[PDB]
Design a protein around this nucleic acid. Sequence first.
RNA 1: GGAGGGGAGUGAAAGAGUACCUGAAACCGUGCGCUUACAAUCCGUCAGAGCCCUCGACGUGUCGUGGGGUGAUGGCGUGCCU
Lengths: 47, 124, 100, 114, 54
Amino acid sequence: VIKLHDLKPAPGEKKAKTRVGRGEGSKGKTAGRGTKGTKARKNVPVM
Amino acid sequence: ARVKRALNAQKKRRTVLKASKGYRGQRSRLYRKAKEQQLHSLTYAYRDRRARKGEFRKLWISRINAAARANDITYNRLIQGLKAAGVEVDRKNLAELAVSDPAAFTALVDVARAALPEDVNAPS
Amino acid sequence: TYAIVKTGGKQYKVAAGDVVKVEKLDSEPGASVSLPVALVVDGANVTSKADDLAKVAVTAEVLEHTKGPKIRIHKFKNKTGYHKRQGHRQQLTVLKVTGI
Amino acid sequence: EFPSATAKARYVRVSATKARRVIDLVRGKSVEEALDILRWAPQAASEPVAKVIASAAANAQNNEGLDPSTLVVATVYADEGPTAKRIRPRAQGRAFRIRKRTSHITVIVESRPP
Amino acid sequence: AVPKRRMSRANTRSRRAQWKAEAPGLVTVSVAGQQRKVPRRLLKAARLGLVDLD
RNA sequence: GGAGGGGAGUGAAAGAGUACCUGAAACCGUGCGCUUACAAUCCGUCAGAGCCCUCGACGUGUCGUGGGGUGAUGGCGUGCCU
């Protein structure tokens, strides 16, 4: 008898969100932006 | 849901501060200085674990050389004679024999002298 | 009398009754093991010839399997932000020598 | 162990270090000699400490019924009490901070054999 | 000149230990019968009854 | 003198006293154990004599698959971040 606690998502259907700027272990002090520059602050337009 | 940062930080702070007991000055009281000193201490421990084998081998070599020279033989000639004779006792137990059992060290010196070639400087 | 016994790539000076920590051996506690000998010193005369050593062996009983001290490793390099925490507890066996 | 009695003066309006300077003179001495030393001590912090020591001696003599002739100042120290913050205006419009410190004085006298 | 660095605990305590008060020396005196301690500087004054003794 | 406190009480608790639930860290004391006044110390780490404490076994103190605190002395050792 399937209950409410027997419901699980499909294998690999959920993925953990990557949180940046949370220490040098995963992505720290830069959040994958490199050193300074235009791209290091806001963005660069496509056109 | 608002989350307070107390417990998560206090855990690691307690571990780091406990690991830094016995240090002098700020290095045993304040978490930041204690963490810096922890980095330095663990790096020093990692390096000294590697260097300790060489340090102890040097001490054993010194003791073996002293004991061998007490028997009128140099350390290098004694080692070459021991290697030629086939005795496989390492330097740690050689130094232990020298310190504790001088008669065994004298016998080993005799067998090393026996195993050495007649003219050590010969091109052989 | 005492002898120098090779086990686990190292040599230990032991006699009858000594307890010595040794690198892990595949033996259940309470069993018995035979180990080679690098030198025998019985009284005064010293046995050092290779074939005499091969003719003799040291029998010891395994007391228990234990673990070494906890070793903390924290690799670090300044101006880099590189850290690497790691731990290690070496496995060991406790051997009581029964005779030579 | 020895029988003993204690007294406490909390929120004494003297700084802790100044009280400690006086206190360090009467550690381990008997009650009478400590009282005379504080009486002839040339410090204004000696009056509160002498009052605490006298109160402790009276507590020992009265409530426990101990003989005052055997009393000895065993444990005595001064801690820090709440401090109030004031402001002293200074040259060129800046304002500095003035701390009005207090202290707590604890004395434990005990009866020791001659 | 301003201090370039914060003084450590050891130096601060070592120099702070020199700020202390000395215990005056007391000698006995006999006034109105009862014996009590008075500094030797005030011996004559106590004997002439010029010092208030609580 | 008061402030404050010690007895005595109320309270289940006064380690709930109108400075009052829980009472951390910084900072300041008191007591005990070790160490320190011929010594050039990123203040730690690896060896390590001595002293004190503690867990077992056997005697009267001496070792042990012991554990702790402090550590004379030797080797090594140019704080963290951008």
